[PDB]
Write a protein that binds this ligand. Structure first.
Ligand code: SAM
Ligand code: 173
Ligand code: ZN
Ligand code: ZN
Ligand code: ZN
Length: 426
């Protein structure tokens, strides 16, 4: 059997609980998506199937919207793509919202595909919609998505007989809002959106006992803390670099619940996250809206320029533990890595280390990868003792958060063996 089970919680609907004590690093579930698509900003930049950023991609002959790294990827993707292809084509100039493209793949998967293992524990039909908690503002947004779906899919779906039985598009989009998974690449950049209905049983905590990590579209659910028999399994739905007030708004707006976890009751880390002059980090927070938009579109040169204007401003500066300063540093590190500016990348990366230790407590895949990036930059620059220490730290974290089932662990072990060989060679 499995190590987890669905159960009805007392006040958060259905959830997942351990059937037996779980232990940090234990693999609990792994799932391909019911449906997934590349995210808007990564479209044309990464392969539609494997979500890897190749320097050579080939677009689908028919729609010219889907792009693939290889014949292998377009073939393995053709079942999921064949019907949307006609739709994307017939709307050529327009491209639909990610949610619409995603729901299209859900519908085709449910109509034309064998039962999906992703629904082993919990199906798309089962997913929470929160419709009785939605604001009229949200409901209006969903109505527009319904009509967008109807437009985009009018070449393949003209009426209900071409939808699953009693399939309601409004409810379907409501489910998408609060059960969408952000698919991240190995470097922890957002590249796609997917539905993993069994995994959607996991409720949220700002101090979770499990973590999900993506290896392409494939999702690994791991325990990151000790977990007792019958204890509910939780993951954090949100970015860790967020104050309690910011988490409140997004958990309300997107997930329709008021978080009662101990961190939100205590404002845990809020004060440290907002150190520095408020006027400055308000401006940086504003600037980050565009920086992250640029990063989403892989516009690294422009990302770096905006980040440098902040990190090396001629006006007042922020401490690196300020979460908005910290985001700017991370964006600039990633841009430098992609632009081949490794000295500068390392300068920014090392500055994020201590803030990441604070804000990503325990075993968090984002900190694991950040430390691995820093260790990799140090290795490449011949800083073997430093690189080894960070690579070991990355492995300490990622043996828990990634595990041997994740291909990045093999890469990291190879970097450990290389770095150790250099240190031996003295
Ligand atoms: C991914 S689903 C989790 C499974 C859901 N409880 C169910 O019955 O299908 C996310 C939804 O569960 C509820 N939820 C998740 N975490 C919660 C929490 N910490 N407190 C209260 N409700 C929560 C919210 O309605 C949210 O929109
Ligand atoms: O339980 C597991 O460890 C696991 O890897 C798994 C994932 C999906 C279905 C069955 C088992
Ligand atoms: Zn590919
Ligand atoms: Zn196509
Ligand atoms: Zn909370």
């Amino acid at each position: 059997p499995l190590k987890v089970e669905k159960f009805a919680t007392a006040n958060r609907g259905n959830g997942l609980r351990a059937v037996t004590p779980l232990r940090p690093g234990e693999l609990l579930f792994r799932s391909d998506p019911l449906a997934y698509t590349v995210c808007k900003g990564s479209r044309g930049v990464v392969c539609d199937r494997c979500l890897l950023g190749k320097e050579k991609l080939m677009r689908c002959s028919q729609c010219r919207v889907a792009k693939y790294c290889s014949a292998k990827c377009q073939k393995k993707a053709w079942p999921d793509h064949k019907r949307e292809c006609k739709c994307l084509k017939s709307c050529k100039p327009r491209y639909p919202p990610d949610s619409v493209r995603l729901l299209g793949r859900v519908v085709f998967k449910l109509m034309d595909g064998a039962p999906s293992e992703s629904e082993k524990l919990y199906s798309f039909y089962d997913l929470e919609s929160n419709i009785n908690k939605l604001t009229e503002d949200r409901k209006e947004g969903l109505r527009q998505l319904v009509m967008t779906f109807q437009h985009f899919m009018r070449e393949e779906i003209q009426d209900a007989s071409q939808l699953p039985p009693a399939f309601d598009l409004f409810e379907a989009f409501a489910k998408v809002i609060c059960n969408s998974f952000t698919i991240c690449n190995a470097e922890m950049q957002e590249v796609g959106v997917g539905l993993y209905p069994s995994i959607s049983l996991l409720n949220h905590s700002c101090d979770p006992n499990c973590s999900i990590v993506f290896n392409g579209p494939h999702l690994l659910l791991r325990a990151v803390r000790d977990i007792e028999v019958g204890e509910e399994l939780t993951i954090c739905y949100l970015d860790m670099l967020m104050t309690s007030e910011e988490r409140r708004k997004q958990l309300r707006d997107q997930y329709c619940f008021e978080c009662d976890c101990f961190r939100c009751q205590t404002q845990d880390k809020d004060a440290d996250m907002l150190t520095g002059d408020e006027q400055v980090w308000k401006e940086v927070q504003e600037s980050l809206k565009k920086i992250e938009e640029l990063k989403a579109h892989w516009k690294w040169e422009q990302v770096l320029a905006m980040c440098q204007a902040i990190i090396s401003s001629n006006s007042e500066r922020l401490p690196d533990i300020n979460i908005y300063q910290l985001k700017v540093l991370d964006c600039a590190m990633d841009a430098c890595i992609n632009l081949g500016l490794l000295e500068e990348a390392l300068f920014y990366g090392t500055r994020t280390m201590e803030p990441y230790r604070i804000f990503f407590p325990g075993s968090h895949p984002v900190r694991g990868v950040q430390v691995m990036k820093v260790g990799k930059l140090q290795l490449h620059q011949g800083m073997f003792p430093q690189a080894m220490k960070n690579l070991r730290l990355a492995f300490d974290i990622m043996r828990v958060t990634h595990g041997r089932e994740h291909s990045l662990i093999e890469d990291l072990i190879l970097l450990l063996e290389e770095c150790d060989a250099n240190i031996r060679a003295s």
